[PDB]
Paper text:
To explore the atomic details of MtbDsbA, we determined its structure at 2.0 Å resolution. The two MtbDsbA molecules in the asymmetric unit are very similar (r.m.s. deviation of 0.26 Å for all Cα atoms). As in all thioredoxin-like proteins, the catalytic CXXC motif is located at the N-­terminus of helix H1 in MtbDsbA. However, the catalytic motif (Cys89-Pro90-Ala91-Cys92) in MtbDsbA differs from other structurally characterized DsbAs, which are generally Cys-Pro-His/Tyr/Ser-Cys. The active-site disulfides of DsbA proteins are susceptible to radiation damage in the crystal and the broken disulfide bond in MtbDsbA is therefore likely to be a result of the synchrotron radiation used to measure the diffraction data. Ordered active-site water molecules are present in the crystal structure at positions consistent with formation of stabilizing hydrogen bonds to the Cys89 thiolate and to Thr214, a residue preceding the cis-Pro loop. Helix H8 at the C-terminus of MtbDsbA and its interaction with active-site helix H1 are unique to MtbDsbA among structurally characterized DsbAs. Compared with other structurally characterized DsbAs, the presence of helix H8 in MtbDsbA buries a greater proportion of helix H1 (buried surface area of 592 versus 401–260 Å2). The H8 helix interaction may restrict the conformational flexibility of helices H1 and H7. Unexpectedly, a ligand, 1,4-dioxane from the crystallization solution, was bound in this shallow groove, forming contacts with Ile94, Gly98, Phe99 and Pro229.
Here, the Mtb protein Rv2969c is investigated and it is shown that it is the DsbA-like partner protein of MtbVKOR. It is found that it has the characteristic redox features of a DsbA-like protein: a highly acidic catalytic cysteine, a highly oxidizing potential and a destabilizing active-site disulfide bond. Rv2969c also has peptide-oxidizing activity and recognizes peptide segments derived from the periplasmic loops of MtbVKOR. The crystal structure of Rv2969c reveals a canonical DsbA fold comprising a thioredoxin domain with an embedded helical domain.
Numbering used by the authors: 57 to 255
The structure:
């Protein structure tokens, strides 16, 4: 998946003869982007159920298009923190990625304070990891990578969603599930994925 964090479960359905997922949903997101927050709060539970029943691989590329000195470089620090978390644990990344887009945490784009690195570290702890994450965050390990990411993957707007490489104009979670079903068919649980309330 390249510069993305790939989230899958043991049940992942793959193309015959290969270990390639039958269905890949690609997300390009900025942790400071308000629409991304609404999108993830609205689709996250469905995508998590799709992953867990094995219907999709969910690939997350966290760009930093909104990053600026005026937001205390939150967009880049948050994305880089997420890559640090994924190095330790994909399960923790799922929780951390969801947490940063929650209503309690996602900062006002034009506000006067933003989670500092200590706060990002504490959020990673809550998502279930310490390990190398504190050093990874404090050293700015993935800052250069996330700053170059929008250019490297040629995505300049967020959120950008694709299904098997095809850009997807999203509306409802159920509509996304219908599209996945067209690809994977009757994966057990797929009908229930549509009506997933929480993650």
């Amino acid at each position: 998946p390249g510069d993305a964090v790939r989230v899958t479960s043991s049940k992942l359905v793959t193309q015959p003869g290969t270990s390639n997922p039958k269905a890949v949903v690609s997300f390009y997101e900025d942790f400071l982007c308000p629409a991304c927050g609404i999108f993830e709060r609205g689709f996250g539970p469905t995508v998590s159920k799709l992953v867990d029943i094995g219907a999709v691989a969910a690939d997350y590329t966290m760009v930093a298009i909104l990053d600026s000195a005026s937001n205390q470089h939150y967009s880049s620090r948050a994305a880089a923190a997420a890559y640090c978390v994924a190095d330790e644990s994909i399960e923790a990344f799922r929780r951390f990625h969801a947490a940063l887009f929650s209503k309690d945490i996602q900062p006002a784009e034009l506000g006067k304070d933003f989670p500092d690195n200590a706060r990002l570290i504490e959020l990673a702890r809550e998502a279930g990891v310490v390990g190398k994450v504190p050093d990874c965050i404090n050293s700015g390990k993935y800052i250069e990578k996330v700053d170059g990411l929008a250019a490297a993957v040629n995505v300049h707007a967020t959120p950008t969603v694709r299904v098997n490489g095809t850009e997807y104009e999203w509306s409802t979670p159920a509509a996304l599930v219908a599209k996945i079903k067209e690809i994977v068919g009757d994966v057990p649980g797929i009908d229930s994925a549509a009506a997933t309330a929480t993650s």
